[PDB]
Paper text:
To prevent this, we describe a method to encapsulate target proteins within highly hydrophilic, structurally homogeneous, and stable protein shells, which we refer to as “nanocrates” for this purpose. Our approach was inspired by the established use of natural virus capsids and engineered protein containers for packaging applications. We adapted this concept for cryo-EM by encapsulating target proteins within symmetric MS2 bacteriophage-derived “nanocrates”. Being highly symmetric, the nanocrates do not adopt a preferred orientation at the AWI, and therefore their enveloped cargoes are randomly oriented. Nanocrate densities can be computationally subtracted during single-particle cryo-EM analysis to allow for high-resolution reconstruction of the molecules inside.
Briefly, we purified MS2 capsids from *E. coli*, performed disassembly in an acidic solvent with the removal of packaged viral RNA by centrifugation, and reassembled the capsid proteins at neutral pH in the presence of ApoF. We designate the reassembled cages as nanocrates (“nc”) to distinguish particles derived from disassembly and reassembly, rather than another commonly used packing strategy in which cargo-containing virus-like particles (VLPs) are derived from simultaneous expression and packaging in the expression host. The @ symbol is used to designate the packaged species. Cryo-EM image analysis of MS2nc@ApoF reassembly showed a mixed population of empty and cargo-filled MS2nc particles (**[Fig fig1]**). From 5,000 micrographs, we selected ∼240,000 particles and used icosahedral symmetry to produce a map of MS2nc at a resolution of 1.86 Å. From a methodological perspective, we found that one could not simply use the published structure of MS2 for the nanocrate density subtraction step. Instead, it was necessary to employ the experimental data for MS2nc obtained for each sample to calculate the shell density for subtraction. The nanocrate thereby provides a built-in resolution standard, determining the principal resolution limit of the dataset. It can also be used to tune dataset processing parameters such as coma, magnification anisotropy, per-particle CTF, Cs value, and pixel size.
Numbering used by the authors:
A (entry chain B), B (entry chain A), C (entry chain C), D (entry chain C), E (entry chain A), F (entry chain B): 1 to 129
The structure:
Amino acid sequence: ASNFTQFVLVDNGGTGDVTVAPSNFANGVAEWISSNSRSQAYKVTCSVRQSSAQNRKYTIKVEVPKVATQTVGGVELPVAAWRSYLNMELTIPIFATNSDCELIVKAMQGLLKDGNPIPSAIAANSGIY
Amino acid sequence: ASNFTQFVLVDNGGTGDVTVAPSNFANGVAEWISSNSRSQAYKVTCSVRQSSAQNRKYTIKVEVPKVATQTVGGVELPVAAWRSYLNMELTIPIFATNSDCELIVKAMQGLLKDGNPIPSAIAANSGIY
Amino acid sequence: ASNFTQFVLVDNGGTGDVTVAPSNFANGVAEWISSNSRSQAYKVTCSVRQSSAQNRKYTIKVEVPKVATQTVGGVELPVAAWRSYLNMELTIPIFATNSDCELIVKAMQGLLKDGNPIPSAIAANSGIY
Amino acid sequence: ASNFTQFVLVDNGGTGDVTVAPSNFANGVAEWISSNSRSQAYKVTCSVRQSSAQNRKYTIKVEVPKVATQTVGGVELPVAAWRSYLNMELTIPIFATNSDCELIVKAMQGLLKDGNPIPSAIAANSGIY
Amino acid sequence: ASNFTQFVLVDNGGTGDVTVAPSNFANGVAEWISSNSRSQAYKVTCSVRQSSAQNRKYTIKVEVPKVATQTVGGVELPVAAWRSYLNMELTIPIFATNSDCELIVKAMQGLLKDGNPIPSAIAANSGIY
Amino acid sequence: ASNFTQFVLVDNGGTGDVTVAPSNFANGVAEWISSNSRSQAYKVTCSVRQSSAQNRKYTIKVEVPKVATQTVGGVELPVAAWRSYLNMELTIPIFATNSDCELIVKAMQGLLKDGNPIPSAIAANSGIY
């Protein structure tokens, strides 16, 4: 069941979608990037290992470019002002079955579903109030 | 209106859905828990802070329990056999607009969407290859 | 093309086969793991290195679990009652051609072919008699 | 009945097979040797012992020669230019049944089956890629 | 689709072409080798890393052997009389777009094109004058 | 056989080609540049020497400007953000003949030929996957 394929990272209704495609598999770490320069591209990485005696840990990183007032192909500095970073670590005990892992995935999807407090706060440049 | 509202963490189609409701805002950490004992409850937390002069960081955590009944000293108690922990750290520059933040949210949603490589690998107890 | 793919480790006809899938490639050690619970999963690893100026060395390991349920204090977990461990080391001089390597592989396959003394002894809980 | 018999180590169709024959059983180590010159012969050994109170351990070794003629000072001798060495150790708990042992054997056979990653890598003078 | 595929390193017009095929990806270094013994094989390696915060560096290496047969202790072995080593280091800023990288590739191709000064000098065992 | 002449570094089908012409021969090091400012020009350098007792080494350097969003004739800073560097060293044993050197040149051309993994990865801002 090979799964290292391109996918739509940002869905805009079919027109203007952001697709990321495989770009590196060194050290077993899967990497996707969009069709941009490295400084302006969307980037996704994922790897999994045995973190402890009874846990496995998925390490997932996503980089998102700032698009407002962007100059496509230009040199934008400082780097920290134009990019957002997501560092996500999912720790799963070795006892969890496929059904348990499906439940965990559903939990993450519900956490980030549109209209829910966490995505609403992030999208509104706000905290919890 | 306040964004600190209850939401469906795990959507099973209307029956058996896991709902978490606001439970604490002490020390600046927003907390949600399911309607269970603290030993067996689902948990969601979220906080935001000025990580540096020009960046803001969201810290989001979710706990998924595997419930069980444990006999301790001849008495049965509701416990969790194990818990799966999700830890998310999201750093956003202060220069990001609302549209940029919406792009970040859509990126995360597309990352965790059903059928995509990372959720498929997590549900299948496997890495990316 | 790529040989870091999933393959059938145990061929139980057409139904009930044990398939292992790539999970990790850290430190140049390829690792395959079967699906469902990690505590009960099969494991295969392989790595190759230049052991001396004139020799290359393969290190191959396989773990076969006996699946069982553990119940301690009323809490049930999926575990391996015990595991069987295979450790293989194969040394091949740099002078060996592809034909020589194919001959070595055929030698190993004939070593483990059904009806031969060593697989018969292993399958019968017996030694050489 | 007896498993200390001659068997085909390398199956080159029907003509040119490499057969090894019993030669020695000293110190509980069974040894097979192919015919013609000992300096150029194939070698297979196998022994089993109680490694711990709960484990039995098989030690299996195979030597594959590269046949050549050595000429020193005008005197010609049949020698092995070099040898490939396989060392296998398999540990099986005393609790394993005959069915469990057959499963272990099938696991090894599937490990070395043609088209699988590890035999392909060995036969192609290659690692995992 | 994966870009880790075999390719013709030396094009002789269809007969006698030197082909290298993927052979290893351990430790993040992609390796290609020709269908020969390791002692006499052609070799290509390639790796990429974040050399600094704003630059990426490709490290590309090629080995061209001059094959021979050496008598060692009265036994003839396949060796390389000598090897020619090519070492390429290519540093690219993260701000470079795909078109910029295509310009880099075209520059290298034009640099090594038949009839040009540098390849003519290399083929003629001479410098530039 | 004088060979220090201008050549097409980047071929764009005859229109828009990038030509580099001789610009310096100090210290015996041949240098080519395009018709630009030194900060924005293509630059090629080449020299050869006896590197060791049994090896000669060609040292070849190429500088490529970032063209996307370029301001022709402008002051672009930092320098490291607008230029890519190739450092290529070819080591050839003193025993190699003209035919061997032609083979080495063919190897380099095949390495960098369009459609092959290394140029594809470089042009796609990607590694090996």
